[model samples]
Target: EGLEAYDYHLPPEQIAQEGVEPRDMARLMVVYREGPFRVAHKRVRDLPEFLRPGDVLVFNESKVIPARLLARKPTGGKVEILLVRERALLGPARKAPPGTRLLLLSPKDLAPVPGLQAEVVAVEEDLVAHLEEVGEVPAAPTAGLHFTPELLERLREMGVELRFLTLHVGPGTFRPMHAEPYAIPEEVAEAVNRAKAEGRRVVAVGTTVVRALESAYREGVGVVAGEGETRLFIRPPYTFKVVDALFTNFHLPRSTLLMLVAAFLGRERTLEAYRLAVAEGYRFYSLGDAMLIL
Candidate 1:
């Protein structure tokens, strides 16, 4: 299908600027791909009622770093650097030429932070390590924000196995495809394999987890354990091997995130759900409401 099929109109006002308080209190849209093939509206806290005891929930435990930084060029021009991945930067192409030295500034006061600077290399460089000290955390991987310690406890008490893996999110998740590092521990792999063997569900927390699990999948051998980078671009007509259910936010129109969702939920039904969400006033984007496709 052409890209036009994925396009939909969402009123600008529906784009959420901030998340709801008490995180888990946010709204959730539940969609069923089989059985009744119906949709339900409920608060996120009601998630436990829909899931069975044997289900395994996969979470992306990768901590989001402050990836955005404000800096000043030696020529006194201001620039904003968005750290994409290790050795990758997204900003004004013309402003950050090779060898350009930039002085990082504190966003609060616009004052230059002493001893914090960066040099633009020809094409590749490393800044992930420095981000802990100089970057600002941008809103991302928002679906996970809905889970609180209490929610996790509730799921655990219900006999839901929560497993975690690391996939340091980058701008690439929203933009075009780019390789991002991810790691899955043996503990997680074993749980997933056993869940599949027992006919239980493996529910992924977000698209990040979906990509990580799908990338690590091997035919006839469940999800393997190891650290690697994935440049996987999941679109329509994809045959998912690992993820059984998805818990994710309402993504932007025409984004790769939407494409992946469409792949799982049929394209027509995905658009119909979006239309209903818009009419029902569900918030959209990074700090918006969530959807549970089962």
Candidate 2:
């Protein structure tokens, strides 16, 4: 509720339905420092020119594979579901009910319900949901969508190395707006820490990369090297440690994604950027234009 300060207005006409033709050809709005705030519009294919050879492009490898399902209930009613991996906790009671697909309910709750017909493979407080699908898995790493084959070749030509982390897309990533369990490998963390120590730039590929890198970066330890779950929810009043620049898609008004960008560029300035984007007719949301912040 307090985060309402991050809100803005975007008409439906601004939302983009698909990536631009060449992918790399998508419009890119550059926001960097001069005295206060300024912007330059360019194409994503031009990314290499702004980077240095020593820079590291941190990426999220947790592919946004198909995690949705579509189905009919016992009464033949239609429903859509999304897979959010699994969790543990809670009671049985009416565990699984009508229209209850395997992906939406916790296995603990759904497992015990016979009417739901989803057998209890491994029951716990929080169980895995067997989900069904319909609409596109909303906001699936807009940066990943921009990374086409030609784009990769161009990035390689820039001579920047790539490091990877994993943060699967799921309900926690949105609903109630928490993150699903995320994993950052030791190697990736090491690279980021090394970049920080060597004074080389550590650029985040997208908001997902920002979360994964920020989640791995802890005070005192610099960046924690390991394979474990991260529950870090970044917003304003937060100081970033690893990400020096971010390449990301335009997010919805009032979204956690927007808050993240605000955290990087301050609230007033971030909203200003959104205003500029809208006025300039840059695409907005999931399959929209990209923005580079430095």
Candidate 3:
């Protein structure tokens, strides 16, 4: 597999740093192919004609959690903490039973680099009474940590809503990557399982969605609710269990997203498609054109 052999010249002007309001108006490019050297172009609204009766178009519905959060330290220094759930970076002694620490990991940027220092002061649940240990020493990464009974109470007092759910991975490491280091969450898995059970196709949108659905299948989880880390890299020689299709935007070179496209559509074809897209003046990155892998 030519997973490592993909790259393209993405122009800076093509990047969408700011999201356009009334998002439905975002620019779109529609592409379809016929013979080996034949492809056609159109717009995003012609989606129905893009497929036939048996063709599948899966959509990811896991709503985004405002997992991104910020915190202030006693030292007058501000710090950002992600909801670390995957690999508990919590030092061997942040808590008890080994892995049951207030947190599993610290932001790599702040580790040993001198920034802010503090402890967990809030949680996302109520009925603090039910809080119990879900983590262990050498804890799970990204997610798998739950709140302690006492900590749950404190979180309530501090205003972290019982209904508000943050991604287990936390804020520090949540920096959006262009699909490299893609991760799958429990929700995406649920969608894929539905597709399989009903004899439907699974279409994952965005890299995050891909992570969730793919992780569910690759690891044999098959859509269950639980927390764990996913360092899953989507490249070739890699087998996809549940994902039947993908809807994604163009991406930066060397990004994980691009790697996934290569893995999905054969490097030769994907590069050629991208070549055509660029020549045809399609924008790239968020709010750009998308490719649907069959």
Candidate 4:
């Protein structure tokens, strides 16, 4: 299918600029892929009712880091940079050429931060150290943002096996496709395989976790434990090897995230869900609501 097949119309006002107070209070749209396709609307805190005891709930615990930075050229022009990787910076290529010097600014006051400066050396310079001093954490991997300590405790009490994997999100999340570093510990891999072998569901918290598990899958052996970089781009017509259910946010139209959802929920049905979400006045995007595809 063409890229346009995944496109849909969402009103600008539907894009949420801020998140709900209690995180889990955000709306949750439960979509089932069986029995003529049904949908249920509820709050995220009501998750326990939908999941069984032995289900393996996977979450991406990669801490969000300050990756966005405000900077100024020596000539006083303002520029913004996004740390896409440990060594790569994304910004205006024409404005920031090789050898260009930039003065990092405080995100709060816009005043120049003392002693923190950056030099562009073909956009692949080591600025991770500088980012620690001035980078501002951008909102991302929003699905996990819905969880609270109380929710975790409650899930555990209900006999759900909670597992965590790490996949540091970067600017590449907004881009078409790119590699990201991810790690799956031995314990987590073991839990996932045990669940799979026992015919229990493996629920992923976000697309990041889905990508991580899918990338680490070892066919007959299940997911392997180790740290590695994943450039796997999940789209239509793809067969998922590890993830059984997905808990994710309402992604942007034509995005790879939406494509992955389409692969799981079927392209036509996914679009229908989006249409209903819009009519219900549900919030969209990172700070918006969430969907639990079971």
Across residues 1-294, which tens digit of lDDT does each residue of candidate 4 receive? Answer: 688899899999999999998989999999986668788999899899999899999998874333465777677877676555554444433354544445455455777766657666443444322433433333344799988888889999999999999876554343336787788989999999989899999999998899999999986899999886688888878899999999999999999999999998889999999999999989999999999999
TM-score of each: 0.74, 0.73, 0.54, 0.74
By summed lDDT, the worst window of 10 consecutive residues in model 4 runs over: 128-137
lDDT of 3 by residue, 1-294 (tens): 333478777677876665444332343444332236444564443334444433333333332222332333344444344334333222111121211112223353322223322354334432011022322212221110112344334434544222211233332334432322223344544544655777765544455655655554445447544443456778765666765655577777777767776777666677788878787777677656555555
Model 1 scores a C-alpha lDDT of 0.80
Report the Cα lDDT for residue 203, model 2: 91
Q: For model 4, which pairs clash?
A: none
lDDT per residue, candidate 2, 164-270, as tens digits? Answer: 88765543344334545567778888888888999999999888778777776778888786645555667777888888999999999888888888888878889
lDDT by residue (tens digit), candidate 1, 1-294: 588899899999999998898899989999976665589998889899888899999998774432555777678877776665553443333354554445465455777676666666444443222322443333344689889899999999999999999875654343336677888999999999999999999999998889999999999898999886687889888999999999999988898899999998888889889999999999999888999999
Residue-pair clashes per candidate: 1, 16, 32, 0
- Stretches > 4 Å off in candidate 3: 1-4, 17-21, 27-40, 48-169, 172-191, 218-221
lDDT of each: 0.80, 0.70, 0.46, 0.81
